[PDB]
Structure formats: C-alpha cells, structure tokens
C-alpha cells in the first residue's frame, strides 16, 4: 500500500521527470495489482478531465488504461472513460493513443470486443484523417489475428463497404490485408453467394497496385477453398485468371515487394490446387507457360510452387517434363551466381515430375552439370533430391562424380 500511495502522490507533482517516472511505475503496478488499477483509473479520469495536465502528459497517461482488464466493471468504466476521451479530445495524437489503448483493453478483456470492433469500423468510415484510418486498419488487423470468431456479419459488411468507398490506395491495401487475414480463418463461415465481400474481392484482384491484387486474389482463394457453394464454383475461374494476371505482372518486376506478392500468389495457387484438382490442371498449364519468360528469382519461386503442386497432386502430366527439360537446357548457360538455386530447383521439379525412371535426358542433365556448374554443393543438393524422389541412378552418377 505504501508503494501505491507513493505512486499516487508523485503523479500530481510538478517535476516532469518525477511525473513520467510515476506514470511508468503506475503502468507496471496496474499490470500487477488489481485494487491499484481501479484507484489509478479513477485518478486518471479526474486528471484528464482536469485542465492542469499538459497535452504530452495526457498522451503519456492514456495507455495506462490498457491494464484495466482485471475485472468486468473496471473495464466497462475504462471504456466509458475512453469514449469520453475520444469525444472531447479529437486531435490526432490522443485519439490515436486512446483508441489503440481501447483496442488493447478489448483484446485483453473479451467482453467488449464486439462494440470495440463496431467503434473501430465507425471511425474507419467516418473520420477523415489518414493516420486515424491507418491506425483503425492496424487495430482491426490485430483483432482479426487475435479473435476472428467474434467478428459478426455486420462488421465484415461494414469493412467491405469501407474498402469499396475509399479512393486511397494505401488504406484500401491495409483494409484488404485485414480482410485477407480474416478470410484465412472461420470468419468466412460466420459471414455466410454474391455479396459485398465477393464483389470487393473481384474488383480488387484486378486493381493496378500489386499488394491490393495479391490480397484480393487471396480473399478469392480462401473463399473458394473454404466452401463449396454454387456461386463459389461459378467464380472459381475468376480467381484462377486473376492469379495468372498477377503472375504475369510479377514475373519480371524484380523488387522485394514484387517478390513478396509473388510468394503470396504462388502460395494461394498451391492452396487452390490442393482444394481444386480440376483447376490445378490449368494452374499447372499457366505455370509452365509463364516459366519460360520469367526472371531468375521468379523462376526459382515458380519452381518451388510447381514442386509443391506436383508433390501433393500426383497426376501432373508427363507433358510437363518436356517443358522443364527445355527450360533446364537454356538455363545451363544463363548466369553464374543466381544460376545455382535455379538449377537445384529445376532439378527438383524434374525428379518430382519423373514418376517413372529416366532416359538420355539424365545424360543431358549430368553433361550440363559437369560442363557449367563447377561448384559441387549444387551437385550435392541435386543428388540429394534425386535420392529423395527415388531417381537413384542419377544420384549414383552425381555422388560418384562428386
């Protein structure tokens, strides 16, 4: 108790260093204690309502309330206080801090999560400031990552409406990221056909920005794989073709953001193929068509995706093997530094595709390796993949050479 009284005393001092220290100590003790939490909640209410406190100290004071999750009534009182705060202090910094603190409080105390989501959606649709909107996006992302099931159909409807209405690319990208994160959980089932989410996802998958397209096609992939409703079977072609468009867009951009979007698209089509084999055939076809004209890193990621496709789904078609062999031939004299990983990934897809034994094409592969590689480690990894997939004669040749 004496420590608590010391914290409470120093909070109303004059020296700003002592006041900041008191705020930090109050944070820690309110994290630990319970009675101290409600006492400090009352003091912070009457202090923020007071006029002596400067703006910066008010900013520092608000996140103390994130520890008021010790009991229901205390959390509700803190919620009323935060509502008062956002009403009567509408400038950017403290609405930012206060609604983020409310998000954390709702995350800790699960009772008030629906109204918190409703408030966040309200601030997303109404408030004009870009920064407040972006914080709303981040907080909804956190809540989606931490409690997707609590989301209602109305919240998803509001979020989709907000995504449709807003013209800014960054806000659209962020809220579609939130929607994509929601789509990879049971939130789709709770949501349920043609609706706002489907129209939004279709519209965004053809958007100019790479990230928006990636998140839209991921929403389409999740909605197609999760449920087998008739409209979903109708729109599953749209997801595939949009995925192909994203693939051709990212096949030569050669930037880290492009690499991330390409990884997202390839993972999406791997999951879709795991869900839809009859779509997987066309997925394989477009992958092979774009393999030849893609860049080196794009080819590496494409080969990883195709290896996953082939490994999970057995009937890939030996017609693949010709295209892979042709691609392997031309890549033999492509580069020196990034050629190594492309070679090992290409050899991996060759071995996975060859469900049966090999032929003189193996002679071509080993001749290309001996002529161009001159590295050994890549030879070792190719032999390791050969032994993995059962092409043991190729492994014997490579190990003997190595």
């Amino acid at each position: 108790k004496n420590a608590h009284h010391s914290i409470r005393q120093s909070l109303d001092s004059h020296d700003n260093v002592e006041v900041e220290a008191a705020v930090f100590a109050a944070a820690n003790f309110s994290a630990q204690s319970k009675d101290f939490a409600v006492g400090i909640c009352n003091k912070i209410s009457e202090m923020i309502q007071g006029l002596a406190t400067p703006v910066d100290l008010k900013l520092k004071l608000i996140p103390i309330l994130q520890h008021m999750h010790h009991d229901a009534i205390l959390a509700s009182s803190a919620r009323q206080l935060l509502q008062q705060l956002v009403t009567s202090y509408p400038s950017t910094k403290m609405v930012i801090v206060s609604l983020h603190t409310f998000t954390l409080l709702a995350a800790s105390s699960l009772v008030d999560t629906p109204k918190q989501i409703q408030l966040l959606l309200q601030y997303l649709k109404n408030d004009p400031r870009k920064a407040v909107k972006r914080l709303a996006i981040q907080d909804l992302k956190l809540l989606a990552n931490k409690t997707p099931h609590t989301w209602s159909r109305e919240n998803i409807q509001a979020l989709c409406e907000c995504a449709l209405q807003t013209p800014y690319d960054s806000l659209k990208l962020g809220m579609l990221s939130v929607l994509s994160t929601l789509s990879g959980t049971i939130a789709i089932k709770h949501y349920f056909r043609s609706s706002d989410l489907v129209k939004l996802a279709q519209e965004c998958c053809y958007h100019n920005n790479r990230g928006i397209a990636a998140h839209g096609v991921r929403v389409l992939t999740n909605i197609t794989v999760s449920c087998q409703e008739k409209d979903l079977l109708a729109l599953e072609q749209d997801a595939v073709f949009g995925l192909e468009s994203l693939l051709v867009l990212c096949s030569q951009d050669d930037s880290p953001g492009a690499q991330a979007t390409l990884k997202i698209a390839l993972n999406c089509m791997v999951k879709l193929a795991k869900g839809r084999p009859h779509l997987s055939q066309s997925v394989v076809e477009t992958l092979l068509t774009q393999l030849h004209s893609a860049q080196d890193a794009a080819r590496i990621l494409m080969c990883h995706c195709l290896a996953a496709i082939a490994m999970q789904l057995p009937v890939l078609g030996d017609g693949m093997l010709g295209d892979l062999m042709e691609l392997y031939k031309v890549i033999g004299r492509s580069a020196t530094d990034k050629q190594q990983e492309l070679l090992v990934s290409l050899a991996t897809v060759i071995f996975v595709a060859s469900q049966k034994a090999l032929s003189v094409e193996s002679k071509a592969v080993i001749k290309q390796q001996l002529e161009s590689v001159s590295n050994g480690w890549t030879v070792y990894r190719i032999a390791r993949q050969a032994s993995r997939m059962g092409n043991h004669d190729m492994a014997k040749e490579l190990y003997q050479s190595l």
Partner: peptide, 27 residues
C-alpha cells in the same frame, strides 16, 4: 510471412554443424 513450399529442402536459414562444415569444405 508465408512460405511457398512447406517441404522445401533449400531453406538454409538454420544450418547444422555437419552441413556447415560440408558447405565450407567444397566452396
């Protein structure tokens, strides 16, 4: 972040001592 292939063997962020020496041996 997500990974394109889960059973990919080329992931070498974690290299054990055996593979560490093996790579350094012949590179």
């Amino acid at each position: 972040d997500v990974s394109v292939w889960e059973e990919n063997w080329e992931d070498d962020i974690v290299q054990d001592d055996f593979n560490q020496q093996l790579r350094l041996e012949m590179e």
